[PDB]
Design a protein around this ligand. Structure first.
Ligand SMILES: CCCCC/C=C\C\C=C/C=C/C=C/[C@@H]1O[C@H]1CCCC(=O)O
Ligand SMILES: [Yb+3]
Ligand SMILES: [Yb+3]
Ligand SMILES: [Zn+2]
Length: 607
């Protein structure tokens, strides 16, 4: 199998075993400058050259054995960047190693990085930098085999201005005054667990920390530290549960970093330092499933890794499956089923958005000539979860299936695998139930578009109240509007309010008078919970309420989580009254946006 997203030599030719990164962060030039020393191991005889991935990097020189060697940058291939061929001065035989030290500088427009001016931060006095390498942006930081089929260890030394803090996806190895420049500090990092390069991460800013667990500090700007320490207090209890499900946590520390609002994702499971959106700071811990998700990647994704992005569902399906077991052990099995059924609803939404014949609704996808950022959706998460939940029910329940999950993690730890590796092992583990497994419509589940061929069984206990109320609103006539009342919500959790809105939004538009009555009785405008507010504002805009336009524009621009920003801009563009202001607002903000978000919103808006 080929990694169609990488231009570098494949793992069948050579493999990077280690990276030693020494670099310096320059906020005036918006550059990372330094050297990347790659220890590469040949997999064949007579290896005299190799190719690495790069994207908008300037190469100063390549040094092998103290001497500068020949190298060439090829033509750029759009989102994949430019291949970099390096001439080896010695021909390598099988399993021989060499160290290649590349001197590089990043472009200020690096798609892996967002550079924030002080005005874009909470404190307003210091700038800020953060990276996002998944899926294929590590090449926009440093030259590498930018494929998850290769795993390497790394150590890093990072020079920054002394009033700023640097963190990486690794164990902190101390800080010292920069010897060459007195005003800069050097932060050291060591990652002894082999990782794919998409898990390399860097942040630099005016960061403070608070300890919330024996192996967990929360990091953020001072303005958010207190709120963050409260919101994520459950982290250690989730880690303990995750260890019961997946086996030992091998990474040492589990720190959390709360990023600026422009962070594009809800979470990123960078090893030793999960990144999360500040839109999780709801004030009541109600969005902690995101933490459970990122914790679970410490097994499914970071330890057992998809060999190419075509098999991304392995990473996300299993992680959602573990996530929902963590929340089930914390809050009960009825809650696990509630979240599982909500996930099916999100799968319905994604299939409707793409269309039921669209190739991105397949579980195993073909990313040939497809930018992974453009294909990204909830399909791998929720179709993958649905497959595992269906299998759980088919094979005798959660205790039995969790036994498989732990064996799977143990079998493929530190490796990169394909859907066939997973399925072959499922059949090996469940030897005594092969007849049961052969009842699965594997072709449909793995390779057909649209909704899965069978829907799992879901407990309805907590969902029933959401259905009742959404149906009341969907079918309401004029003589029902006065009977709605704030008491309709008295026995609904925030999770049930969110699912009520999700169910109602599936049937939007509602009549405008109905939405106005909904605000009158429920005061959803006052809710700051980002998930609820998102769905509420989508419902209002899709239902043509002009008063919601400024609220939706504000939410779309004051944070940058793509889950929220992209649909809010798309809804505003589809509403005739807000279309021009949506486009103008995007044009005015795009220079200050995260580069990937700016690209995707521009595509969405057809600018
Ligand atoms: C669907 C085919 C595309 C293959 C992967 C392509 C792009 C993915 C790029 C970055 C992914 C970062 C994922 C971090 C943790 O699972 C994410 C939870 C946050 C998700 C959200 O707010 O929707
Ligand atoms: Yb320069
Ligand atoms: Yb096979
Ligand atoms: Zn994930």
């Amino acid at each position: 199998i080929v990694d169609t997203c990488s231009l570098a030599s494949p793992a069948s030719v050579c493999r990077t075993k280690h990276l030693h990164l020494r670099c310096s962060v320059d906020f005036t030039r918006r550059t990372l400058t330094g050297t990347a020393a790659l220890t590469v191991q040949s997999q064949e005889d007579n290896l005299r050259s190799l190719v690495l991935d790069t994207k908008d990097l300037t190469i100063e020189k390549v040094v092998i054995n103290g001497q500068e060697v020949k190298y060439a940058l090829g033509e750029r291939q759009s989102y994949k960047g430019s291949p970099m061929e390096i001439s080896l001065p010695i021909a390598l035989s099988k399993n021989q190693e060499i160290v290649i030290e590349i001197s590089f500088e990043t472009s200020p427009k690096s798609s892996a990085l967002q550079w924030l001016t002080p005005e874009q931060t909470s404190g307003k006095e210091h700038p800020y930098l953060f990276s996002q390498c998944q899926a294929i942006h590590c090449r926009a930081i440093l030259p590498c085999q930018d494929t998850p089929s290769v795993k390497l260890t790394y150590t890093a030394e990072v020079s920054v201005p002394k009033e700023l803090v640097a963190l990486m996806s690794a164990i902190r190895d101390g800080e010292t005054p920069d010897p060459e420049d007195p005003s800069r500090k050097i932060y050291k990092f060591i990652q002894k667990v082999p990782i794919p390069c998409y898990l390399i991460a860097l942040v630099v800013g005016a960061l403070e920390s608070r300890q919330i667990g024996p192996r967990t500090l929360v990091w953020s700007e001072k303005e958010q530290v207190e709120k963050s320490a409260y919101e994520f207090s459950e982290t250690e209890s989730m880690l303990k549960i995750a260890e019961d499900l997946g086996g030992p946590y091998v990474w040492g520390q589990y720190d959390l970093l709360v990023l600026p609002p422009s962070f594009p994702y809800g979470g990123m499971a960078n090893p030793c330092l999960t990144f999360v959106t500040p839109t999780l700071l709801a004030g009541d811990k109600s969005l902690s499933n995101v933490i459970a998700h990122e914790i679970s990647h410490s097994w499914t994704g970071n330890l057992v890794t998809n060999k190419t992005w075509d098999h991304f569902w392995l990473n996300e399906g299993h992680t959602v499956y573990l996530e929902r077991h963590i929340c089930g052990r914390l809050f009960g099995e009825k809650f696990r089923h509630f979240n599982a059924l909500g996930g099916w609803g999100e799968l319905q939404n994604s299939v409707k958005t793409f269309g039921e014949t669209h190739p991105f609704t397949k579980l195993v996808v073909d990313l040939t000539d497809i930018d992974p950022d453009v294909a990204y959706s909830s399909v791998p998460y929720e179709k993958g979860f649905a497959l595992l939940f269906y299998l759980e029910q088919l094979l005798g329940g959660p205790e039995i299936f969790l036994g498989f999950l732990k064996a799977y993690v143990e079998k493929f730890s530190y490796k990169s695998i394909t859907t066939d590796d997973w399925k072959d092992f499922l059949y090996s583990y469940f030897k005594d139930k092969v007849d049961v497994l052969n009842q699965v419509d594997w072709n449909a589940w793995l390779y057909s578009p649209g909704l899965p061929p069978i829907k799992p069984n879901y407990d309805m206990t907590l969902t029933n109240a959401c259905i009742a109320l959404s149906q009341r609103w969907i079918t309401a006539k004029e003589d029902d509007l006065n009977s709605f009342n704030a008491t309709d919500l008295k026995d609904l959790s925030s999770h049930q309010l969110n699912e009520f809105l999700a169910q109602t939004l599936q049937r939007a538009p509602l009549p405008l008078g109905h939405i106005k009555r909904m605000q009158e009785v429920y005061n959803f405008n006052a809710i700051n919970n980002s998930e609820i507010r998102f769905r509420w504002l989508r419902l209002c805009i899709q239902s043509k309420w002009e008063d919601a336009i400024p609220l939706a524009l504000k939410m779309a621009t004051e944070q940058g989580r793509m889950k929220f920003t992209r649909p809010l801009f798309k809804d505003l563009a589809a509403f005739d009254k807000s279309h021009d202001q949506a486009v103008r607002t995007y044009q005015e903000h795009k220079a200050s946006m995260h580069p990937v978000t700016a690209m995707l919103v521009g595509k969405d808006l057809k600018v």
